[PDB]
Backbone:
RNA sequence: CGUUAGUUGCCAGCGGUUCGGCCGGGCACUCUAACGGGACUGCCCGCGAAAGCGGGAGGAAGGAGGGGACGACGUCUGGUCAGCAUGGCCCUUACGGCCUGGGCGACACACGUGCUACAAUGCCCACUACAAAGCGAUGCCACCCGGCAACGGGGAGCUAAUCGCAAAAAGGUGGGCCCAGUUCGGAUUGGGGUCUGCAACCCGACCCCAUGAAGCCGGAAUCGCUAGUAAUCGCGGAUCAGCCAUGCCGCGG
């Protein structure tokens, strides 16, 4: 059922299926499935409405989530522009942020490739 | 009462005492099938007996340590065999044709410098 | 009950110099639990042969401490004589214990 | 600068992080074994002479 | 192999049916040097030829293998002007290997999700004589024969 | 496997310890 | 990343504190780019060395826990 | 395989065992490490003028039993004046020196060598001695407590076949995922912390929460390896405060 934000998992274990949220990892899922006492191996497909809510409430209230987050991070990085620290440009200049080479690799933070010529 | 052999196999040493009668086999203070559990080949370690027809009319007590489970498996195999030549001179004339008596000389050959791994050299690109 | 250690680089002259201590403790002492050889402590160095880039082709050097142990159960001053002084070690160390 | 340098590496310094080994023979910053104070070079050297006690050529 | 003609590395017989040819097969199934799992698989596969057919596994195995051995094949040949696929017979060691190689390969190409089933079906389907192994057998035999014209070089 | 610090393997490989591989 | 002080430089506070007994300076130059920017000692525009020169960095509230050189970048067209 | 030798082995054999080879008792065995023995085409068949070649017996080992160290006259006007040494030449309020900071880490791109994957012969979690080289007294850190953890307390033992790093991992057994860009894969980025160091912005590694990218086995090309090898799985060391080691030199399964 609809847990977080405008969210609906399905037809798989709840532990796994909880995962399908932005902010719910494999760790926060264990934590929730015992601090509200729901066996994890059950398929969503068949679980109490008593339990869909005891989940719902735990989750939205324990922590920041599903696009509240997407906006927070969004809002963080736009601050790293500030007056302008290092990590700022870097984000501004779409380059690796955490002190690692750019001569080779840096593919994950760069557009496929952008080949040219050279060498004589 | 007692008999002995010392099986060895690639860092693995096999203290083996047989005794007549039963069929049970204690290995490092455990039944054979508790130590070698699922390990499909172990049934071979007691192949030397099936060779002489002493099928399972010895017991045997066995310490075996050093390295490897399957190396141990073969180690024992040498004891179980080196034990019965020393409880019958003529236990020989039909274990040689099958050669449960050779040590098995083979061992982790050494890592040489410049190679990756003893023999495996690295990767030549040429241009 | 005497427990004397013998460390060394030279294998041949522990078994030499400290098997005078299996005589001069048998002739004027009595009982001897023979030399017991403790496993060696090998210290390997590995150097690239040339002064420059030839990262393959190296040489191997090992400096090995041979460890030897002696126990004798008749502690007299009948013994602390040749075993006070009467020498042939020259690059050995010894730990004297009881 | 190798002179003013060999000396400065004998001193004690503002902050002990700035310390370091240095082939006491062949005055050398890199690959200086701790049990010798000796650049792998000025070393393979002595080793070969025998000026290094108990150090043999390894073989297995 | 310039000097000698190489001894055919002999194999320990099987610790079950007592057959070299089985271990041979087992070896091919083995991956990263994990002979254990390899063996489990082949035996567990013989179990799915009880549960499925009244026959003895070994006999099916033998008889499937015998069905995937090629008799002819095109060995390549250069001559100064073109390339010639020349049909020669197949020496019994090569037969042995191609078959057993092919089975495992044919088998790992199948759909079912589990080691011991893929082996099993293949083994059955090819002793009937309709394996995807047996495809890449009649193909080789056919490829020779179509190049039957060049079959007068055979060195 | 060997690259997820949150597998056990991830930590054997890295050599480290923690939640996902504790010191016995 | 530390948590026992903020490893910020002696010579810098001496100058900041004793500047704030009435002090409104920009001419304030420094080479201590590894010193953490200290709770609210703002206003003053510090001049940070990047290896070549001192940069006019005017400082604000929102840039506190950051070290000083994050604002004096060390290389060109990046 | 033998000889020599007992703070590592042991009911191997019997006694005590709070059932930890711990307690006497013993080196038989295993092992540790020093010296010896063993293989020579010596034996039998067959071919040959011989050397030797094909077989067979004995034997742990057959015909160079398996791995090293070991690199002929010389060749590449090969490499290195930046390890050192050295002829020659050039600087000598500077081409010497000393410091603070920065750079050697830049990034439209392109090759090399690798690591990790693309999964079910797999991933995950639980349990479950198969051990086979090394390092440790400005250290290895058993054990306790605090912390999900990194790590922080207290604190024992061992100048270390005695104590510690140390869990080997693949494996086995149970359970779980059901072919899904997934419980495959862990790049990227956000946040909160640990440690070493005067100091971690540029430029450390580690732990945890979140985020989860490309990748469904790779064109023309092209690399390694013939047996305990290849393939696969962990272990240690050197340098070193720490570490950018997936590298290197080594060990075994
Ligand atoms: Mg560089």
Residues:
């Amino acid at each position: 059922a609809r847990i977080a934000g405008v969210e609906i998992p399905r037809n798989k274990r709840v532990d796994v299926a909880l995962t399908y949220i932005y902010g719910i990892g494999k760790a926060r899922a264990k934590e929730a499935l015992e601090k509200t006492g729901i066996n994890p191996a059950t398929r969503v497909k068949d679980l109490t409405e008593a339990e869909v809510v005891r989940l719902r409430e735990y989750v939205e209230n324990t922590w920041k989530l599903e696009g509240e987050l997407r906006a927070e991070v969004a809002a963080n990085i736009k601050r790293l522009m500030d007056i302008g620290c290092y990590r700022g440009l870097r984000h501004r200049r779409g380059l690796p942020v955490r002190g690692q080479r750019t001569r080779t690799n840096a593919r994950t933070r760069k557009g496929p490739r952008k080949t040219v010529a050279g060498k004589k | 009462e007692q008999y002995y052999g010392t099986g060895r196999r690639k860092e693995a040493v096999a203290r083996v005492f047989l005794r007549p009668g039963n069929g049970k086999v204690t290995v490092n203070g455990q039944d054979f099938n508790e130590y070698f559990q699922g390990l499909v080949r172990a049934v071979a370690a007691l192949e030397p007996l099936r060779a002489v027809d002493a099928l399972g009319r010895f017991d045997a007590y066995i310490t075996v340590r050093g390295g490897g489970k399957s190396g141990q498996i073969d180690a024992i195999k040498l004891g179980i065999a080196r034990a019965l030549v020393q409880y019958n001179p003529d236990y020989r004339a039909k274990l040689k044709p099958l050669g449960f008596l050779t040590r098995d000389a083979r061992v982790v050959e050494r890592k040489k410098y410049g190679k990756h791994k003893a023999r495996r050299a690295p990767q030549y690109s040429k241009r | 009950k005497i427990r004397i250690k013998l460390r060394g680089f030279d294998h041949k002259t522990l078994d030499a110099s400290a098997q005078k201590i299996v005589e001069a403790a048998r002739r004027s002492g009595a009982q001897v639990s023979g030399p017991i050889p403790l496993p060696t402590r090998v210290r390997r160095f590995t150097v690239i042969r040339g002064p420059f880039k030839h990262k393959d082709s190296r040489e191997h050097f090992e400096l090995r401490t041979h460890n030897r142990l002696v126990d004798i159960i008749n502690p007299n001053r009948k013994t602390i004589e040749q075993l006070m002084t009467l020498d042939l070690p020259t690059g050995v160390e010894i730990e004297i214990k009881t | 600068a190798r002179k003013a340098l060999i000396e400065k590496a004998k001193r004690t310094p503002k902050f002990k992080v700035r310390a370091y080994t240095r082939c006491v023979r062949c005055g050398r910053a890199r690959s200086v074994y701790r049990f010798f104070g000796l650049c792998r070079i000025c070393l393979r050297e002595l080793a070969h002479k025998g000026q290094l006690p108990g150090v043999r050529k390894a073989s297995w | 192999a310039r000097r000698r003609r190489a001894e055919v590395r002999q194999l320990q017989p099987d610790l079950v049916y007592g057959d070299v040819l089985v271990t041979a097969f087992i070896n091919k199934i083995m991956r990263d040097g994990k002979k254990n799992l390899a063996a489990r698989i082949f035996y567990d596969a013989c179990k799915i030829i009880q549960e499925k057919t009244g026959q003895e596994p070994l006999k099916v195995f033998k008889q499937a293998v015998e069905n995937v051995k090629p008799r002819m094949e095109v060995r390549s040949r250069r001559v100064g002007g073109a390339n010639y696929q020349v049909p020669m017979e197949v020496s019994p060691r090569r037969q042995q290997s191609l078959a057993l190689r092919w089975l495992v390969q044919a088998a790992n190409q199948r759909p079912e999700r589990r080691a011991a089933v893929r082996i099993a079906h293949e083994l059955m389907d090819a002793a009937e004589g309709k394996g995807g192994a047996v495809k890449k057998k009649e193909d080789v035999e056919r490829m020779a024969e179509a190049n039957r014209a060049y079959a007068h070089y055979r060195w | 496997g060997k690259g997820d610090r949150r597998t056990r393997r991830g930590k054997i490989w890295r050599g480290t310890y923690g939640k996902y591989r504790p010191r016995k | 990343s530390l948590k026992k002080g903020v490893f910020v430089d002696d010579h810098l506070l001496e100058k900041v504190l004793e500047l704030n007994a009435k002090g409104e300076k920009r001419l304030i130059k420094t080479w201590s780019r590894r010193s953490t920017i200290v709770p609210e000692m703002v206003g003053h525009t510090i001049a940070v060395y990047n290896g070549k020169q001192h940069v006019p960095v005017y400082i604000t509230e929102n840039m506190v826990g950051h070290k000083l050189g994050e604002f004096a970048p060390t290389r060109t067209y990046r």
